[PDB]
């Protein structure tokens, strides 16, 4: 169902897109995984520890 939903959107089925590099402008070999992860900011902030 993840693959079938990735086929409803026009995305590649493997979940992996070829990505270029912003520094060199040239392709990363062996396509990498891009997606959306729900990332959280925990309350261990660095200018309360320094």
């Amino acid at each position: 169902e993840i693959k079938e939903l990735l086929k409803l959107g026009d995305l590649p089925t493997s979940g992996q897109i070829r990505l270029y590099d912003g520094r060199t402008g040239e392709q990363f070999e062996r396509p990498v995984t891009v997606g959306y992860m729900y990332m959280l900011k925990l309350n261990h902030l660095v200018d309360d520890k320094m």
Partner: peptide, 11 residues
């Protein structure tokens, strides 16, 4: 909505 959803590359 604890955190936020962001575009992540694994490499």
């Amino acid at each position: 909505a604890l955190g936020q959803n962001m575009r992540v590359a694994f490499m």
